[PDB]
Symmetry: D2
Subunit: 324 residues, 4 copies
């Protein structure tokens, strides 16, 4: 408990020992990290959130992440929350976002993978699952994460937004939806193209912070921020990154074992018999993660330079462990 | 031509004579609704399935088709003045006429044709007669389920597909897996395009296609990729949905009465609830005639002019009727 | 027009004068439905809540009550002839009168009163105008969700509670968890008891209670456990649901006209689908009068005679009206 | 492969090594045991069930049992299926049930706990969970297990009943609902009362098997049969029984840990700090399992004598471990 309170002092740092916090909290990393961030940002007072209500909702939300899913679980959620909390604190964005925008980004991060079954949208579509039927094969999981995250507010003593005005609730809800729907990898190339356009036309205020003077630009930055947090594993200290790689490959390989036993075509990087884990990480960095983080780094220059350096060091480490 | 080789009733002969106009713009769809005992969608869909030989092509058991159509029609609301089974029947039949345009002869496969007419049939099913924004503002279960995003269009799809699971309702039971996967994708792409939030981008793409328009030796449109094929089918069904002002005036006037009854009821619900009354939903501060002229000038004529260019000159009489009706409504403005 | 300003409109004053009968058997509920612009459930629930001081007792904000009532009423189907918002308003008002019977003076708590009146309000919400068996035989999604077991009664409850989550609809927001759990249990026990499959066991239990009937110091029923208290509330609401033949004949006949319209519509759907036509649903082979005498002799009279024994002699005039109406229907049979 | 085939030779015996089968099948005990039983009973030929359709439905059903739940998982499902299969085979029921009734009992067994979250109905009710709202706090999970088991027939190549006639489908669906809704412990006392009445008025055919000449009696026996299978753990060899007790207590204590952290009242026998594992097992046997199994044993006398003897031996063993 002393040891937990001590790990939690690193909540404003890139590279928080999130797996240690998961162990020390009795598998409550999302609850303890969200509560710590809400206290640090004074969101309970700003939004008149009863503390019992916040903890009941966080326990409820965390309980709806699957303990049997190796990657898309409550530890990933806690990690995305905490990574978004650090990116919101970047000097280039100081005083740019309102308290409601900050609440939206953090809540969006907390709920963004809730009730993830550990299989892809394409798996749910191919099996004619009830989820794919309900969501017309379109951002199936991302739509579901949102509906679950909002629906859990109706459980006993779970409505953390009970003291927001209707106008606050409507704005918070629209921003959360816009953010989580943007975590669908189908939207990655269009999000990145828009971030690059903003970098090429970047304006700063006289205080040297980003100028975002319309909803479109404000929500683009929040979408790309939470997308960066979601795609942040290769930017973390290598000891953390390697644990995340082991977890995503366990999850992918289990999907491929389900595809194989069902006579389905095995999804890319899901065949444990035809795998190159290290080459796949170098490819993920070269094609997805480095392009995104290099553009983010230009938007907030020079705030993210150490994150980009770590990304490049970690890319060289995976390259160096690709077998013969 | 309905063959006759036996004596039949009054009502039967009149219904049969009206159904002979199923391949024409300006079908007497309200008369068919009355004559069929409020089964316009069932009788019009069945007639079009026969006209296109879809039962034979897709091995649809006739009992299954009739059961599915009556089930689908039963999930349109009898108390909704505009977004009901008569509108569904009208969009199906309008789409059926647009598929037959000379510029599209032999362009679409039987499965694409099936997708366009099935999408038309289901595109407003279980419509409550209020807008997405009303469902969003009340924190409706539907708005929660669909994250405030194309709420009703998502729902229409889910319902239209779910109704295939009722007893003897699976009209696709004899499709192969590959046909079902392709049909499903096309139907989703078409119905989600009927959200008016999508209209400006749809119209932009149709405009781009007109400018880069390629024709075959036959003088018929060249559509050689899914993106172009689905864009035409999306715009085709959206034209069918927005076709009321292009119809013979006696039809157009009834469609206007119905949409304004539905809008005014929504405004009466907003008023009683202390909500902001939605645009053209306030019966105390409405200009039905000005709104139709605005609807034509800013939505319907821009779409239909662009459609008429894609299929030039096939849609000239439709555009002429639209321009005449616009002048009629204009002339009734105080 | 002269704007209104804190005085009733003439139509509102006429509605107020009709609502002076809210404590009487035989309220002009159809006239209330017309005068209120098809808001009988909202206006009658609001009147009864004010009369029983339930807003102060349960700290229910008036805007929340009105919002929830309009929402609930809006989820009754305007196209369904019998199982609609007028039927809900009638069961509410009938329950309200039964709760006031001298034999029950000071017996029930405010929470039990709230449970009986709320249960009555929600007991048929979102009724599609067809029977459980119709929904089971068509493999409807509702029958799938509820395992063919009290399908509509389960749905009415789920919808009545789910609508509390719409914007400014949670009328129970100020109740304690203990109050909410008790209210919820009582409401569920009552509405599930409106399934006619439960009628014989409910009546068997009411008879047992009449036989072992104990009064108190003041000649009022003694109910000293949950089992007997809920039994009486279940039978009370079931009598209210089955009250139409106990009303003045001008009201009873409007109810018979509506149930037969609803039943015949179900039979027309069964006929067109090739299904067996349900009992009393064939408009070509029905005896409305024989069916009402049967309904009374086998279902309504045995229930009301037993209720009348429980509350002796408070229900004598209700039982006399029932017997007079039974004689009237019998005398109209060829 | 060869070891699995060897263990599955025991599929017609009480006391099958179901945990070993779970390990050898790669956590597919439900799929392999159902497939074996369908093949043994010739149900694929009788009901024209395509073998690929059967295996796809079984793996889909098995996948909807939660891998993180210690007791109410695919191993429990496999166990209840196999236990029902042995009970249907009893001499007293030879040629009594039709192939459709046998199919109904084995299908109901397979689906009877699907999508169990590892918490009780009361926990779902107290939290205002979406399931409890849908089901009006009434047989919440039992209704849900049925809805799920039927809905999964609609996934791609899952409709194992596609070649039944309409009348066969209507009959099967009614029987399956009747059987699963009877696994609700709220129905146990009325079910046992009716089984006792049947034993008191027991008739046998001219061939000496149970005489059941109406639906009410036939469904009564199938309901009690699957209820016996569900409550069969204390009747198994003690090494199997103790493994089941370890699992149900892990599941209960996890529920109590969730109640405690939420500030809820801890459910009976869910408090790991105030537990009587051994006294609870003896109470369970004395008040529920022994009255049920003694009555079943009367109904099929003497077929269940060894099962009843094992139950009484295990009851004495646990009694011997209860502190003073
Ligand atoms: C620690 O390494 C990882 C962490 C996280 C993810 C990841 C997987 C799926 C999603 C996301 C991230 C965000 O939204 C998703 O749907 N991946 N994904 C890969 C590879 C992959 O296949 O990436 C391509 C995908 C994301 C299109 C194998 C290389 N590695 C990693
Ligand atoms: C015969 O006249 C009409 C027919 C149909 C429609 C219509 C209404 C709503 C939707 C659609 C069409 C398609 O998707 C929808 O959500 N309207 N709508 C208008 C006006 C209107 O407000 O237009 C709104 C635009 C954005 C649809 C008053 C002029 N008139 C008519
Ligand atoms: C004014 O006359 C009526 C009013 C109300 C009802 C009624 C119908 C269905 C339900 C209930 C009441 C309560 O729960 C139900 O499911 N019936 N039902 C009949 C007949 C009938 O079939 O009654 C037998 C039913 C109740 C099983 C045709 C004679 N008449 C009337
Ligand atoms: C290996 O021993 C066990 C196995 C299974 C079960 C069990 C638990 C819950 C349900 C069922 C069985 C069937 O339907 C249910 O809702 N129990 N339950 C107990 C105790 C218990 O609490 O029993 C009372 C329950 C059955 C209400 C601790 C003593 N032990 C065992
Ligand atoms: Mg995700
Ligand atoms: Mg629409
Ligand atoms: Mg009812
Ligand atoms: Mg169970
Ligand atoms: Zn994620
Ligand atoms: Zn439409
Ligand atoms: Zn009723
Ligand atoms: Zn079980």
């Amino acid at each position: 408990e002393d040891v937990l309170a001590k790990e939690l002092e690193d909540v404003n740092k890139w590279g928080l020992h999130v797996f240690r916090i998961a162990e020390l909290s009795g598998n409550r990393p999302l609850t303890v990290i969200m509560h710590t961030i809400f206290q640090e940002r004074d969101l309970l007072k700003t939004f008149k959130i009863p503390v019992d209500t916040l903890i009941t909702y966080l326990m409820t939300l965390e309980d709806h992440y699957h303990a049997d899913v190796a990657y898309h679980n409550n530890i990933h959620a806690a990690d995305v929350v905490q990574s978004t909390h650090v990116l919101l604190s970047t000097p280039a964005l100081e005083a740019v976002f309102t308290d409601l925008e900050i609440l939206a980004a953090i809540f969006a991060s907390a709920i963004h993978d809730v009730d993830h079954p550990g299989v892809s949208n394409q798996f749910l579509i191919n099996t004619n699952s009830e989820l794919a039927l309900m969501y017309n094969d379109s951002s199936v999981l991302e739509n579901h994460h949102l509906a679950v995250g909002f629906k859990l507010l109706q459980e006993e003593n779970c409505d953390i937004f009970q003291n927001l005005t209707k106008k606050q609730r409507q704005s918070l809800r629209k921003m959360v939806i816009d953010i989580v729907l943007a975590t669908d990898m189908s939207k990655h190339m269009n999000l990145l193209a828009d971030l690059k356009t903003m970098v090429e036309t970047k304006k700063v205020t006289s205080s040297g912070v980003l100028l975002l003077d319309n909803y479109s630009d404000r929500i683009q930055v929040l979408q790309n921020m939470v997308h960066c947090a979601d795609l942040s594993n290769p930017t973390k200290p290598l000891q953390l990154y390697r644990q995340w790689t082991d977890r995503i490959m366990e999850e992918f390989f289990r999907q491929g074992d389900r595809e194989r036993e069902r006579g389905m075509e095995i999804s890319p990087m899901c065949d444990k018999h035809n795998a190159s884990v290290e080459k796949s990480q170098v490819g993920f960095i070269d094609y997805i993660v480095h392009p995104l983080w290099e553009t983010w780094a230009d938007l907030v220059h020079p705030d993210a330079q150490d994150i980009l350096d770590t990304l490049e060091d970690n890319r060289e480490w995976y390259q160096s462990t690709i077998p013969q």
